[PDB]
Design a protein around this ligand. Structure first.
Ligand SMILES: O=C(O)CCC(=O)C(=O)O
Ligand SMILES: O=C(O)CCC(=O)C(=O)O
Ligand SMILES: [Fe+2]
Ligand SMILES: [Fe+2]
Lengths: 332, 332
């Protein structure tokens, strides 16, 4: 049930802003950072929303105006799409699937250019949608650097330490239009997801739901993304999608979602909620050291078998046929 | 068409002695050892019957009486079976498939004991069948050693040399009753198959017919044997068996069949042809050094993936499910 905003400013959102899907979900716990339960959750690689880390306290004031004035003159990656769905794809892998035709394009531009584009679409009542997604780097301005420095490094570093995680690989800045969706996928890094402006509905599925989510082949540009269209699931190709069960939540300014490595996540900017801003924190996972193996370990194994076959056969497209030959009449 | 025996002793066999199966076959070439064509065949790992190598010239006189008198007092492995089919199984792997119940048993005995058993069955009109299969070793007697030494090492060593093969790992002595069958399987060694007494129908299928022959899982005791019952093929489980095509031949005393590594072979002692004697020569293949990959290389790859998964998951029985999870909805 939607939380009330302090000061009797009313419900932060309502049901009508949520997209409707075919599967049930349970709530992800929202807890204080001081609550031992949060600590058990993270320890065990289960999601949790922290409500009070102050992780990006200084970024709460960010909006387009402030960012345009201060984020520098560096290039920003902007995806454009004709649907609300921004399926991620890896350009490096595009050669090996000539028949893949992306639904969204990436364009490099200056922050002011992005803002202007956002302005033009609004005014022209256009249907185009944009999603800025760009790693924060040295080109940003002084004030931003001040802000960034003002993040609660104290708290997150301890987190990195307690969990034996690896280094911070990056912080992605995501600014998106209301209604935008990042379709379900998994990332090979641990992620603290810091919501700053707007609200994002986050739907997660644990690693052991691999059978239900049908990730594209490792060598395909959509490696790590599910093949199922959540808007119109095709149960013939993907029958187990009828057994999927999610953990969901809505994060707002100030909240931090722990999205544990290998957990599937689907992320949507609320309908009619205005733009959203988020900053994630991606850490390399801890080192691979016991049976029984954990789901994510099995996932690792499967990935590796695909990669090995790819290399050994000399053509990733040969991977499927070999696997089929391997199991039909033998293991299926 | 059956060859005529020298001296107008008539046809060495006839069609009625051949078991009938569902698939077509073509003849394997019979050539003289001096014929360059044989040499191209072996070079290219394709079967050929050599008619004049004199490889086991001294063994041609062997029969049960001579062997009993001279083969020593060592133990001999004897398989017993209630069907004409002697499916091979690897006792080391029996633990991991508690539900496998072998159709034939192995019994260790003295050659004279084997002979006696053969005598008792005959006299008692029994239906039991035996197949002696035992590697030739030091315990054999003087005369046998003389014979063995009299093999055409000159010729076979050159063969080993020309093909860069590895060492002779062994020579199996196979003595079997008329009608006995070794069901189709593949061996990971190069094999010169030297027929000595009786006739054996040999049906071979090249490595690229893997999809048609459905080998048991690598960790199963029947690893390397086809799962299809050639006598009553189950096309629902094994639909591609309807596309299988063999190379066949009948070897007799003096002939040598080159059964190249990874080639499937099915071997049968002619109905009503009396006992058979054969000696094989197994060499480790040459070393693994280019695309496109050869069929047998793909077979190697598949074997290895199965072995790796086995070890990595800690339970071979977990191998199938993982593979199924890997491909369904993804590669199939
Ligand atoms: O917020 C989004 O739209 C995507 C974020 C995401 O997928 C991630 O941080 O892994
Ligand atoms: O002759 C037989 O029955 C079996 C021989 C065989 O399978 C082999 O030498 O690989
Ligand atoms: Fe992600
Ligand atoms: Fe064999």
């Amino acid at each position: 049930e939607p939380r009330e905003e302090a000061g009797a400013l009313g419900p932060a959102w309502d049901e009508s802003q949520l997209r409707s899907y075919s599967f049930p979900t349970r709530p992800i716990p929202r807890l204080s950072q001081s609550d031992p339960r949060a600590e058990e959750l993270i320890e065990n690689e289960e999601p949790v929303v922290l409500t009070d880390t102050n992780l990006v306290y200084p970024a709460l004031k960010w909006d387009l105006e402030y960012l345009q004035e201060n984020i520098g003159n560096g290039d920003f990656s902007v995806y454009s799409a004709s649907t609300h769905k921004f399926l991620y794809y890896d350009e490096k892998k595009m050669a090996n699937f000539q028949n893949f035709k992306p639904r969204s394009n990436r364009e490099e531009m200056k922050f002011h250019e992005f803002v202007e584009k956002l302005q033009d679409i609004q005014q022209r009542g256009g249907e185009e949608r944009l999603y800025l997604q760009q790693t924060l780097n040295d080109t940003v301005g002084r004030k931003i650097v001040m802000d960034f420095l003002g993040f609660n490094w104290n708290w997150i570093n301890k987190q990195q330490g307690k969990r034996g995680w690896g280094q911070l690989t990056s912080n992605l800045l995501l600014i998106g239009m209301e209604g935008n969706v990042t379709p379900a996928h998994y990332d090979e890094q641990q992620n603290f997801f810091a919501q700053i402006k707007g609200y994002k509905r986050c739907i997660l599925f644990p690693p052991d739901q691999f059978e239900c989510l049908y990730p594209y082949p490792v060598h395909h540009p959509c490696d790590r993304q599910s093949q199922v269209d959540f808007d119109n699931p095709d149960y013939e190709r993907f029958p187990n999608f009828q057994n999927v069960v999610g953990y969901e939540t809505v994060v707002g300014p100030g909240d931090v979602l722990y999205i544990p490595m290998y957990w599937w996540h689907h992320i949507e900017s609320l309908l009619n909620g205005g733009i959203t801003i988020t900053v994630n924190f991606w850490y390399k996972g801890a080192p691979t050291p016991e049976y029984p193996l954990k789901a994510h370990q099995k996932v690792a194994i499967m990935r590796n078998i695909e990669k090995m076959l790819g290399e050994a056969l000399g053509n990733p497209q040969e991977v499927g046929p070999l696997l089929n030959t391997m199991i039909k009449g033998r293991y299926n």
